[PDB]
From a paper:
Here, by x-ray crystallography, cryo–electron microscopy, and site-directed mutagenesis, we structurally and functionally elucidate the mode of binding of a potent bnAb (NC-Cow1) elicited in cows by immunization with the HIV envelope (Env) trimer BG505 SOSIP. The exceptionally long (60 residues) third complementarity-determining region of the heavy chain (CDR H3) of NC-Cow1 forms a mini domain (knob) on an extended stalk that navigates through the dense glycan shield on Env to target a small footprint on the gp120 CD4 receptor binding site with no contact of the other CDRs to the rest of the Env trimer. The HIV-1 envelope (Env) protein is a heavily glycosylated trimer consisting of heterodimeric gp120 and gp41. The most broadly neutralizing bnAb isolated from these sera, NC-Cow1, had 72% neutralization breadth on a 117-virus panel, with a half-maximal inhibitory concentration (IC50) of 0.028 μg/ml.
The NC-Cow1 structure was then determined to 4.1 Å resolution in a quaternary complex with BG505 SOSIP.664, in which human Fabs PGT128 and 35022 were added to facilitate formation of diffraction-quality crystals. The preformed complex was partially deglycosylated and purified by size exclusion chromatography (SEC) before crystallization. In the crystal structure, strong density is observed for the glycan at gp120 Asn276, but only a few contacts from the stalk HisD42 and ArgD43 are made with this glycan (only ~19 Å2 of Asn276 glycan molecular surface is buried by the Fab). Other minor differences between the crystal and cryo-EM structures occur in loops around gp120 residues 364 to 371, 426 to 432, and 459 to 467; however, these differences are likely related to the low resolution of the structure. The antibody-antigen interaction buries ~834 and 768 Å2 of molecular surface on gp120 and Fab, respectively. NC-Cow1 Fab makes two interactions that mimic CD4 receptor binding. TyrD31 inserts into the gp120 CD4 Phe43 binding pocket, and ArgD11 makes a salt bridge with gp120 Asp368 that emulates the CD4 Arg59 to gp120 Asp368 interaction. ArgD11 makes the important salt bridge with gp120 Asp368, while ArgD27 makes polar interactions with Asn280 and Asn283.
Numbering used by the authors:
A (entry chain F): 2 to 52, 52A, 53 to 72, 72A, 72B, 72C, 72D, 72E, ...
B (entry chain B): 519 to 553, 569 to 662
C (entry chain S): 1 to 82, 82A, 82B, 82C, 83 to 165
D (entry chain R): 2 to 9, 11 to 27, 27A, 27B, 28 to 95, 95A, 95B, 96 to 106, ...
E (entry chain G): 32 to 58, 67 to 134, 153 to 185, 189 to 309, 312 to 321, 321A, 322 to 353, 359 to 397, ...
F (entry chain G): 295 to 309, 312 to 321, 321A, 322 to 348
Write the structure that this text describes.
Amino acid sequence: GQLVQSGAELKKPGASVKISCKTSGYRFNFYHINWIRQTAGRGPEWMGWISPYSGDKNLAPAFQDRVIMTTDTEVPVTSFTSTGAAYMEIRNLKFDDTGTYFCAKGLLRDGSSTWLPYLWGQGTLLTVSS
Amino acid sequence: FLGFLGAAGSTMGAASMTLTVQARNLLSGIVQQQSTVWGIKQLQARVLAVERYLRDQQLLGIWGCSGKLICCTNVPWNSSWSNRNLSEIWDNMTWLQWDKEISNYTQIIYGLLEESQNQQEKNEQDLLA
Amino acid sequence: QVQLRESGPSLMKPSQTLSLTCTVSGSSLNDKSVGWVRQAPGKALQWLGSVDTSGNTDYNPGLKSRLSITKDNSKSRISLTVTGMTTEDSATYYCITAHQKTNKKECPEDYTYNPRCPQQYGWSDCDCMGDRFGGYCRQDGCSNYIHRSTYEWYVSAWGQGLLVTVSS
Amino acid sequence: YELTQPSSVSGSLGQRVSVTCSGSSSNVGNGYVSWYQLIPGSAPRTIIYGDTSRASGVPERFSGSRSGNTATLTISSLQAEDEADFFCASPDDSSSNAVFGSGTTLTVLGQP
Amino acid sequence: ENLWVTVYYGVPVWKDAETTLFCASDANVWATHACVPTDPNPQEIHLENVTEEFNMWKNNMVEQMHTDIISLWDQSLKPCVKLTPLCVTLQCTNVELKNCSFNMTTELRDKKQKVYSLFYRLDVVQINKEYRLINCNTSAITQACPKVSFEPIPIHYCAPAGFAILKCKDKKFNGTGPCPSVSTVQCTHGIKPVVSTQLLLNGSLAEEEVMIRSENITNNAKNILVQFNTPVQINCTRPNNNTRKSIRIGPGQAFYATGDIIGDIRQAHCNVSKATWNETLGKVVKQLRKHFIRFANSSGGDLEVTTHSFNCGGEFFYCNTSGLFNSTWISNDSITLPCRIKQIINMWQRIGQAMYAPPIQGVIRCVSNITGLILTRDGGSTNSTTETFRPGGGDMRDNWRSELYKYKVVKIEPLGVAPTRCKRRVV
Amino acid sequence: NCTRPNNNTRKSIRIGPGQAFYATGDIIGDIRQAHCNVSKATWNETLGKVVKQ
Ligand SMILES: *[C@@H]1O[C@H](CO)[C@@H](O[C@@H]2O[C@H](CO)[C@@H](O[C@@H]3O[C@H](CO[C@H]4O[C@H](CO[C@H]5O[C@H](CO)[C@@H](O)[C@H](O)[C@@H]5O)[C@@H](O)[C@H](O[C@H]5O[C@H](CO)[C@@H](O)[C@H](O)[C@@H]5O)[C@@H]4O)[C@@H](O)[C@H](O[C@H]4O[C@H](CO)[C@@H](O)[C@H](O)[C@@H]4O)[C@@H]3O)[C@H](O)[C@H]2NC(C)=O)[C@H](O)[C@H]1NC(C)=O
Ligand SMILES: *[C@@H]1O[C@H](CO)[C@@H](O[C@@H]2O[C@H](CO)[C@@H](O[C@@H]3O[C@H](CO[C@H]4O[C@H](CO)[C@@H](O)[C@H](O)[C@@H]4O)[C@@H](O)[C@H](O[C@H]4O[C@H](CO)[C@@H](O)[C@H](O)[C@@H]4O)[C@@H]3O)[C@H](O)[C@H]2NC(C)=O)[C@H](O)[C@H]1NC(C)=O
Ligand SMILES: *[C@@H]1O[C@H](CO)[C@@H](O[C@@H]2O[C@H](CO)[C@@H](O[C@@H]3O[C@H](CO[C@H]4O[C@H](CO)[C@@H](O)[C@H](O)[C@@H]4O)[C@@H](O)[C@H](O[C@H]4O[C@H](CO)[C@@H](O)[C@H](O)[C@@H]4O)[C@@H]3O)[C@H](O)[C@H]2NC(C)=O)[C@H](O)[C@H]1NC(C)=O
Ligand SMILES: *[C@@H]1O[C@H](CO)[C@@H](O[C@@H]2O[C@H](CO)[C@@H](O[C@@H]3O[C@H](CO[C@H]4O[C@H](CO)[C@@H](O)[C@H](O)[C@@H]4O)[C@@H](O)[C@H](O[C@H]4O[C@H](CO)[C@@H](O)[C@H](O)[C@@H]4O)[C@@H]3O)[C@H](O)[C@H]2NC(C)=O)[C@H](O)[C@H]1NC(C)=O
Ligand SMILES: *[C@@H]1O[C@H](CO)[C@@H](O[C@@H]2O[C@H](CO)[C@@H](O[C@@H]3O[C@H](CO[C@H]4O[C@H](CO)[C@@H](O)[C@H](O)[C@@H]4O)[C@@H](O)[C@H](O[C@H]4O[C@H](CO)[C@@H](O)[C@H](O)[C@@H]4O)[C@@H]3O)[C@H](O)[C@H]2NC(C)=O)[C@H](O)[C@H]1NC(C)=O
Ligand SMILES: *[C@@H]1O[C@H](CO)[C@@H](O[C@@H]2O[C@H](CO)[C@@H](O[C@@H]3O[C@H](CO[C@H]4O[C@H](CO)[C@@H](O)[C@H](O)[C@@H]4O)[C@@H](O)[C@H](O)[C@@H]3O)[C@H](O)[C@H]2NC(C)=O)[C@H](O)[C@H]1NC(C)=O
Ligand SMILES: *[C@@H]1O[C@H](CO)[C@@H](O[C@@H]2O[C@H](CO)[C@@H](O[C@@H]3O[C@H](CO[C@H]4O[C@H](CO)[C@@H](O)[C@H](O)[C@@H]4O)[C@@H](O)[C@H](O)[C@@H]3O)[C@H](O)[C@H]2NC(C)=O)[C@H](O)[C@H]1NC(C)=O
Ligand SMILES: *[C@@H]1O[C@H](CO)[C@@H](O[C@@H]2O[C@H](CO)[C@@H](O[C@@H]3O[C@H](CO[C@H]4O[C@H](CO)[C@@H](O)[C@H](O)[C@@H]4O)[C@@H](O)[C@H](O)[C@@H]3O)[C@H](O)[C@H]2NC(C)=O)[C@H](O)[C@H]1NC(C)=O
Ligand SMILES: *[C@@H]1O[C@H](CO)[C@@H](O[C@@H]2O[C@H](CO)[C@@H](O[C@@H]3O[C@H](CO)[C@@H](O)[C@H](O)[C@@H]3O)[C@H](O)[C@H]2NC(C)=O)[C@H](O)[C@H]1NC(C)=O
Ligand SMILES: *[C@@H]1O[C@H](CO)[C@@H](O[C@@H]2O[C@H](CO)[C@@H](O[C@@H]3O[C@H](CO)[C@@H](O)[C@H](O)[C@@H]3O)[C@H](O)[C@H]2NC(C)=O)[C@H](O)[C@H]1NC(C)=O
Ligand SMILES: *[C@@H]1O[C@H](CO)[C@@H](O[C@@H]2O[C@H](CO)[C@@H](O[C@@H]3O[C@H](CO)[C@@H](O)[C@H](O)[C@@H]3O)[C@H](O)[C@H]2NC(C)=O)[C@H](O)[C@H]1NC(C)=O
Ligand SMILES: *[C@@H]1O[C@H](CO)[C@@H](O[C@@H]2O[C@H](CO)[C@@H](O)[C@H](O)[C@H]2NC(C)=O)[C@H](O)[C@H]1NC(C)=O
Ligand SMILES: *[C@@H]1O[C@H](CO)[C@@H](O)[C@H](O)[C@H]1NC(C)=O
């Protein structure tokens, strides 16, 4: 399956930005959708995940109050695949929030690592500047 | 408990723990008062149900599993059927897409099963002093 | 990828009979037929004849009596016989394969032939009735037959041709 | 029977020409005329079939059309390689009985 | 890391299958005889996470129901009195309806009787006054038994054991496609086999928005099915107070003639609330525009397919729908529709025989929910300029598709083979 | 080879509601009775092998 994220946005510090993540080639309702970021100063940082099926969310404490993760309802394609869309809106941007953001499909439907990011999108570049 | 076919969308293991519901609710018995087109229909359908059931039971018995449900064999899993490891199969696919992925090689597996069981029984016949 | 190879005599005496052969190799047909066309020097093409896969033969009506076409499936060839050769018959003879198909009058898809509608109500261009009307006649479901030519023919492959001269 | 064609036609480089093919209801009127190009030297090459359908490899500038019992072959962007005798043809009541036209010769003037 | 195959019996696996279904009823010769009474409580088991493809147009439950209704119709008509001798030359005078006197065989072979009956204009045609019934030169005729009732009662179509019926519970579910919410049942809901043309009667209503279902919208040849979310009400009455005259025409045989009319000289009709029909028509054109507008009548010659044909109380009504389909849209005062009545009908005279619906004594009045419609486009004009919609009821199968759209038949394949790290005990 | 050479014609006469009898119309063609030919050579070979068995 393919994960296609929104392209890129330039935002001023203090503003907000909303990144999208449209999915296809797999059942969107079944695998968790994670949001992970990468900046040059702090390296890789896991932000949170959301379940397209139940709406359950788990946010890292560093982003619990400024990040909003949402999902749409899966659009069926055949029976074993579908198309979907998840969104992440990050607000109060700062210079250290500049980096690449990824949405990622989980590994297994059940087990010891269900949410584990397995299939990744191409990434969305967020620049915070004046 | 979810009911008949309740775990159709579940993982293969989640459904595998409750195969007995689906297996039991497979045979009905819906009495009668036909004493007619409707009667011909009800009589014809009656036969087909237990017919499929007995075909499946025949297959179960000619594989060394007339006791139904869960049984193991001496046939190794040839990698050419599917290349997925255990975790992926039992916690990423449902039984429907599984049978879709393995329908190409189902009858070969059935033949391997019958032959392994026949060799086991020949060994049993050899197995006395 | 169809290949055609002509063979036969290069010289006939006046009133002799000309027997030619065309060997088809690498058949790739779809119904179709195999036949012969001719062209005398300085003259137009004149269709001569053909034979189709069902065994039916056909000949140029103005020349049939002097022509004869046979086939042999084992040798994968066909023959041509031309009696009473004159200077008029000196010509280039092309072996051809041609697409032949008769289209009967057919209703468009999702329509079925229903003559009751025009018989009893007199409508025009309503030989076909929408299947959605379950054998009932609806003017909103009328339709003519599929617009197309009744007869389909064109040459799909040409052999290189064989020149036949009649001379003493 | 023979379909009526003009004896010859000609035109200069970078132009359009048309060839008429007059028959009757039983051949051209059936609406399945075909057109064939015979260049002196090479073997005949099928060019148009079914009034308008182009054979494989035939460029677009070769167009086949038909009005009633008259078929038309239109040739645009004339090139030196077009000079040839052109024959129309059609089934005649039978899908195995074929009839040809008298032929029209195309000459191309103004070459280098 | 060493894998061996292991057999699983009772795996949730099913495949698309066509089988011979059976009926179910509980509360009328067609379904009260039916078969086995339904279970006190049906089990509808939701199947989480399951998305299954449905196709109402390639559905075999429709063809099965169609042939079943046909065969039941023949089985109920066979034992009844066939009116082959009623093809005597008729001498008719005016009262539309005509008073016809004719000879008839009595019980004794040698004796004859002159009786008179009232016949609607559609049943009789003149030859050279002298008249005959319209059917007598096309086919034989048989009279529907008076006891059997043409009232449709709900009939549940059930799958045999080892098979299952899948039911799409998606409210916005298109006719065909993947259904994200699927439950399984052994038998469908109570489907009334309402024989109708044009507008659908007594069907089931779609939840949320009204539904437009075709096999191909852009293709004019494929009909258009409409299912309401809100039912409209239609009241149909035959005001004439007819009387039934039983005249004996042989040992046991008895023809039910129409006596003289009692009461008004008014023709049967149906009212539909104009307000509710205007709301429903608006929502219809909104769902029509979701894929694209005027509405016109259909004019195709056969009265029984051009008119809203149906059965009510045992009489067969054929209704002018012109009041409902005279409109143009670019985004109580109940309308009244005239209905004529036929007692001779041929929906399958060629397959078999014709039916004489016996006259019904007294005034007739039935109230029906109008839940659906059946439409058809015209021939394609200049594109996207204007679109015209005329109502049709060309076939009866579309009614079965109208109530079988949500159901699907599958066979259970309880045999699954899967790899585990398990080997049987060595001998 | 068996042939009935008479070129018969079928006349559908209606004898009641639905019933229709198919009468034989006037003959078209020869006044010849149906027959069957059998090749005498092949039948002589076959008859010989028959009497041998
Ligand atoms: C239909 O398909 C869907 C989608 O595929 C499928 O749902 C998946 O089901 C599988 C198994 O059935 C799930 O895998 C399991 O997930 C279990 C639940 O995860 C727990 O953790 C969440 C995070 O909790 C944190 O955050 C909260 C605040 O949000 C905080 O309070 C906590 O303390 C913690 O910090 C939690 O949110 C989540 O809660 C949801 O679910 C509970 C019920 O469990 C409910 O009460 C809530 O309201 C909320 O909806 C939940 O608590 C997890 O426990 C489990 O791990 C154990 O079990 C496995 C065996 O299964 C062991 O191997 C393992 O060692 C653990 O002991 C396992 O990971 C999967 O997450 C679902 N979702 C997917 C895949 O997207 C349905 O089951 C399918 N249904 C059918 C019928 O087919
Ligand atoms: C649902 O209903 C719609 C009704 O409009 C159908 O759409 C039309 O379908 C017909 C064929 O069924 C189309 O007509 C055919 O078009 C062919 C070319 O198709 C390509 O080009 C068109 C135009 O650009 C594209 O729109 C299309 O997507 C294709 O890329 C022609 O080659 C055909 O001509 C040949 O066949 C006919 C007989 O069918 C012969 O008479 C001809 O001589 C020739 O041999 C033909 O004209 C039509 O174009 C479609 N409409 C539109 C607007 O495109 C759908 O097909 C239908 N759905 C299904 C599943 O059937
Ligand atoms: C489908 O549509 C048709 C018409 O198209 C309807 O037919 C009408 O039905 C109503 C019944 O609801 C009939 O109404 C009757 O009217 C009588 C006369 O009233 C008229 O006169 C007064 C004063 O002049 C006006 O104010 C009034 O508006 C009328 O113009 C009444 O006398 C009747 O009352 C009866 O009941 C009372 C109490 O029980 C008795 O005391 C009376 O004596 C009387 O028996 C009655 O209300 C109307 O006449 C019908 N019209 C026609 C043309 O027949 C259908 O009802 C409608 N629905 C269907 C068919 O389902
Ligand atoms: C769409 O669905 C609706 C709902 O089912 C149908 O409406 C039914 O219409 C039928 C007519 O075909 C009705 O049946 C007849 O009702 C008459 C009126 O009933 C009154 O009187 C009885 C007396 O016992 C009361 O119990 C009742 O409550 C009413 O007050 C009766 O006179 C009829 O009886 C005759 O026929 C029956 C059956 O054959 C015989 O047993 C009798 O002896 C007698 O000869 C008959 O019962 C029915 O009541 C309506 N149902 C409802 C719920 O209103 C529509 O017909 C249907 N649409 C179509 C097109 O069919
Ligand atoms: C079972 O046995 C019967 C007889 O017992 C056979 O019936 C004969 O069938 C043949 C067909 O094979 C008929 O033959 C016809 O003969 C016509 C006249 O030929 C006679 O005259 C010439 C010259 O005088 C003699 O040389 C010749 O031997 C005959 O005595 C021909 O004119 C017919 O030819 C047709 O075809 C050509 C080409 O298509 C046309 O141009 C002709 O105009 C003509 O239409 C034909 O060959 C013969 O007449 C039949 N005999 C009788 C008595 O009827 C059955 O054939 C045989 N097999 C069955 C029944 O299966
Ligand atoms: C034998 O059974 C047949 C069943 O197939 C009967 O055929 C149908 O009979 C009905 C009436 O009995 C006809 O309906 C009439 O059709 C005419 C046609 O109008 C046009 O033609 C007239 C004269 O030809 C012309 O003057 C008009 O201007 C029209 O152009 C209508 O005008 C009538 O109103 C009426 O609808 C059917 O047409 C007829 N169908 C066929 C296929 O014949 C047949 O009648 C039975 N035999 C007898 C003697 O009644
Ligand atoms: C088709 O026939 C239907 C009947 O089978 C029609 O439905 C009926 O329509 C009439 C109006 O034309 C309704 O009458 C209304 O009744 C209400 C409520 O009455 C109750 O309350 C009053 C006090 O307000 C009390 O006095 C009564 O005793 C009742 O307890 C009145 O408020 C209205 O003013 C009006 O009179 C019928 O109620 C209704 N039937 C049912 C079962 O509801 C339908 O309209 C017909 N459709 C067409 C298109 O003709
Ligand atoms: C019953 O009817 C049968 C037909 O249904 C009869 O069989 C036919 O018998 C005739 C002879 O009476 C055969 O005709 C022969 O054909 C061969 C071969 O023809 C081919 O080759 C020649 C060149 O020699 C070529 O010109 C042709 O176009 C063919 O390609 C000739 O050599 C013979 O001289 C003779 O004309 C039929 O072939 C034969 N039918 C079949 C299908 O073979 C049968 O004899 C009848 N029986 C009785 C008892 O009457
Ligand atoms: C249909 O036509 C028949 C006959 O053509 C009509 O029957 C006739 O009805 C009248 C009454 O309108 C009868 O007249 C009365 O008959 C009694 C019989 O005892 C007699 O005693 C009275 O003095 C009076 O004449 C008549 O007898 C009867 N039969 C005939 C042959 O005329 C029938 O009424 C017509 N139906 C309709 C709806 O018009
Ligand atoms: C649907 O509506 C169409 C009109 O678009 C109806 O056809 C028309 O019906 C009217 C009846 O009011 C006809 O008017 C009458 O025509 C007769 C013809 O003999 C004439 O003698 C009368 O004086 C009167 O003018 C009208 O001609 C007719 N037009 C056409 C084109 O059919 C149709 O009946 C309606 N059908 C349904 C099922 O609703
Ligand atoms: C079997 O017998 C019947 C009658 O017995 C024959 O039918 C008759 O055929 C002749 C012709 O041979 C008819 O004559 C012509 O009738 C037309 C009718 O319009 C008339 O206009 C001519 O002027 C001529 O007279 C005759 O009418 C007809 N019917 C009768 C009652 O004679 C039939 O031909 C016989 N079949 C065979 C095979 O002989
Ligand atoms: C019924 O709805 C389904 C969607 O549930 C339609 O399916 C789409 O059809 C179009 C063709 O116009 C395709 O391009 C899409 O890819 C289809 N989607 C899916 C998910 O399969 C279907 O066409 C509708 N049927 C009608 C008659 O309108
Ligand atoms: C496994 O499958 C392959 C391909 O189908 C076959 O060639 C081989 O014999 C099978 N058995 C093995 C590898 O033991």
